[PDB]
Design a protein around this ligand. Structure first.
Ligand SMILES: Nc1ncnc2c1ncn2[C@@H]1O[C@H](COP(=O)(O)OP(=O)(O)O)[C@@H](O)[C@H]1O
Lengths: 182, 182
């Protein structure tokens, strides 16, 4: 009941944390969260002062799942694993480790996922075949960026009917809560 | 519509507006100011067949009405109408209705571009042509596209909202073709 009475500031700040503060490190993430919390307290909304993002937004079930998985015991990567699911639009993973690839191709098996990248030879037609099929990908190393997947990243509005979704270039598209590309 | 729109700063817009008032009162003597100029100096060929001065209440009623009829037509995402998008829609329609109109919209990404234009082209009966980009996109394909749209505009007597992005302007030699086209 108190959670309904003071859901405003807390859930607004958690959602704003997912949306805006994804590029920044732990220091700037916490600085943004604390400045937002202080201003919300100044906005006559008296909430839980001691809130962490991994204990508010996510649950200990998926926390233990990621701890017992191949993900290491580190708060930044557990928080980013939470961010891997609570997103809306197609993100990028700016990483020097590249360990998200084994995560994606290990927990993505039933969709018959394919290993695709940017600098490989299997990109001038494998991207088009993946668009035709409708399967998720984790193409990496964006330094030779393909401008043909900008409609995919843009998610244009074109309604004609309903089928398995894919945001193609010159073909009709549909809507479904199934496919997302990384 | 020519000068105050293009300026970045609201202070610059205010200075331009007050000097418009100053020059109008300076070189338009013995004319009442309240009828010579006002705050909502807006024109459209929809309230009547003449560009009669339009007041805030009726233009806002019109903009709510057109958005209300556009709700179920194409856009499943609710377009939000306000003081700037209303002005930009009327500016873009004035430029479309003007002969040899050619508008350079300078602004941040997203924010209303290529959705205001698509919406206005849908409600004004115009056609929409967009350029796809593949690898080895030579200028010959663009020249063929320009030939077909020019013959559609002139030979087939059809007003065209020819829209282009920053993804199909990567090459250099064909950029100045639009210069002499203008
Ligand atoms: N004034 C506005 N009201 C509501 N939504 C807007 C407004 N301006 C921009 N948007 C949204 O911002 C997004 C960015 O538009 P943009 O990506 O340029 O369209 P497109 O998908 O055709 O490229 C659009 O999906 C649009 O819904």
């Amino acid at each position: 009941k108190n959670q309904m009475s003071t859901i405003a500031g807390d859930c607004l700040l958690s959602a704003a944390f997912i949306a805006y503060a994804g590029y920044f490190d732990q220091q700037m993430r916490q600085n943004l969260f604390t400045t937002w919390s202080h201003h919300l307290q100044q906005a006559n909304i008296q909430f839980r002062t001691d809130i962490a993002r991994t204990e508010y937004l996510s649950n200990a079930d998926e926390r233990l799942r990621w701890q017992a998985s191949s993900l290491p015991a580190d708060d930044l990567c557990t928080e980013n694993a939470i961010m891997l699911k609570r997103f809306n639009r197609y993100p990028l993973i700016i990483d020097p480790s590249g360990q998200a690839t084994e995560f994606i191709m290990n927990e993505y098996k039933d969709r018959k996922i394919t290993r695709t990248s940017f600098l490989d030879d299997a990109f001038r037609k494998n991207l088009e075949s993946a668009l035709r099929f409708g399967n998720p990908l984790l193409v990496q190393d964006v330094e030779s960026y393909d401008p043909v997947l900008n409609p995919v990243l843009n998610r244009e509005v074109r309604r004609t009917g309903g089928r398995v979704l894919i945001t193609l270039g010159d073909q009709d598209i549909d809507l479904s809560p199934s496919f997302v590309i990384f | 519509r020519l000068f105050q729109d293009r300026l970045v700063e609201d202070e610059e817009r205010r200075w331009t507006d007050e000097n418009i008032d100053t020059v109008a009162l300076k070189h338009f003597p013995n004319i009442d100011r309240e009828k010579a100029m006002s705050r909502p100096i807006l024109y459209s060929n929809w309230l009547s067949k003449d560009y009669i001065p339009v007041d805030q209440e009726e233009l806002r009623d019109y903009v709510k009405a057109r958005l209300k009829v556009f709700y179920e037509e194409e856009l499943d995402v609710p377009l939000v109408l306000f003081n700037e998008v209303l002005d930009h829609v009327l500016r873009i329609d004035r430029i479309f209705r003007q002969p040899q109109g050619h508008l350079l919209l300078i602004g941040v990404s997203g924010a209303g571009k290529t959705t205001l234009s698509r919406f206005v082209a849908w409600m004004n009966g115009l056609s929409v042509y967009q350029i796809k980009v593949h690898r080895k996109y030579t200028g010959e394909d663009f020249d063929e596209d320009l030939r077909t749209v020019l013959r559609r505009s002139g030979c087939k007597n059809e007003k065209i909202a020819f829209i282009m992005d920053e993804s199909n302007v990567l090459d250099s030699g064909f950029l100045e073709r639009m210069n002499t086209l203008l």
